[PDB]
Subunit: 114 residues, 4 copies
Amino acid sequence: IHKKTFDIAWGDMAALGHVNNARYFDYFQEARIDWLRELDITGPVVIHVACTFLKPIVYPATVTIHSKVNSLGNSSMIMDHDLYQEETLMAQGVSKIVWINKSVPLPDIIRNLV
Amino acid sequence: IHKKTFDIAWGDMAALGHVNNARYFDYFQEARIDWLRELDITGPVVIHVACTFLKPIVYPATVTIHSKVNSLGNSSMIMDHDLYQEETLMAQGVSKIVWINKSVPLPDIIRNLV
Amino acid sequence: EINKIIHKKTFDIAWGDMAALGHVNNARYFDYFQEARIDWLRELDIKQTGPVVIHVACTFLKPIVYPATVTIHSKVNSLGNSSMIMDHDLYQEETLMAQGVSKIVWIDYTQNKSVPLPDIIRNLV
Amino acid sequence: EINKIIHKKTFDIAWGDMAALGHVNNARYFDYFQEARIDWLRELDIKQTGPVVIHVACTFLKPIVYPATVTIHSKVNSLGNSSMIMDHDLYQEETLMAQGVSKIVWIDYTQNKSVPLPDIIRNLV
């Protein structure tokens, strides 16, 4: 639903030779900001973030983050990021985003991302 | 069980004025490496990592990561990181670490961290 | 010959690149010059003996702000026996936001001994 | 007076600071000088008008490797009307791993106009 291609930086690599896991969260966050900026987004805050590391990534690489929403509970949402190197899936991201200091019903430009 | 005090860097702050969430994973990872280095640790790999963001952090700050293990299923472990600013809890980290490309029984210097 | 722009790299600023006071951290600029330089050496087919950075500098003429698409135009000069200098001009649109400089030396990595510059770089005279 | 070490900061290298080829990335050095400089200005009680970095440089004499405890000894010179220079020597143990330099200018932030240096810095003559 939202796609972002980009290249791994040589300095995103940690000493044992592949992307630091923490940079995966820099990647998912940029992807989230990008998408929200397209949508022209009282605000969200990330309450939770997680990654599952399937395959380690090496320089050089071109990768693509397929972002999608998967549940809206009013005032809350869950958002998935899938990180592909070529057709291979290298990691799964998942963020819980809330709207706000108290809970405001979900914007209506995302209710509509369905 | 493992404690690490340290100071937030001015450049760990993102534009809206408080620590980038992604740096929380730099913090938990260093804490994990530190501890494993004390323990003198075929190897682990992080398969999963997650954070829950309770309170945002601002410069300057002194914070402390209380790390502990919480389940060993042979060949797997779950490790918690709790990040305190003063006596206040600012976020909860949780990593799943596995030993290895196939599953080796858990080292015996961690079985012993009980 | 030398002081010509032999490399141009376009890209976008990550929202995380920004420091607290609302412009790009200045350490990150070096991350950008570092990427322009590595990409350029890949063109040339360069990647046990090889380049290391002995010095690097940057002058900050204008601050950069998210969102932003910048371009780095790289040129080279001062080739010595092992050494070479590489200037980077970082543009946003038509405006020059910063001028970088990085001195690179060729060594034997395992033996840390200075070693004469590759031929493919020498031919840029 | 000026060129004396007026600041010393001890710390440890993060395992993440290292770049692929097994020593500390060179952008991160600037993160260290940046922290030494901010800490020093906090001593002096410095934090709408204030310092910005116009230039920053570093010479890399020896590579740093994880694990490592380093010390940055900072000194100042070349005070001008708005400008000042600040040298950083980065030590591991008794060995000098890199020499940094950073030129700072005092401005009005909202108005980007050069402004005369604070008195508390001037008194270091």
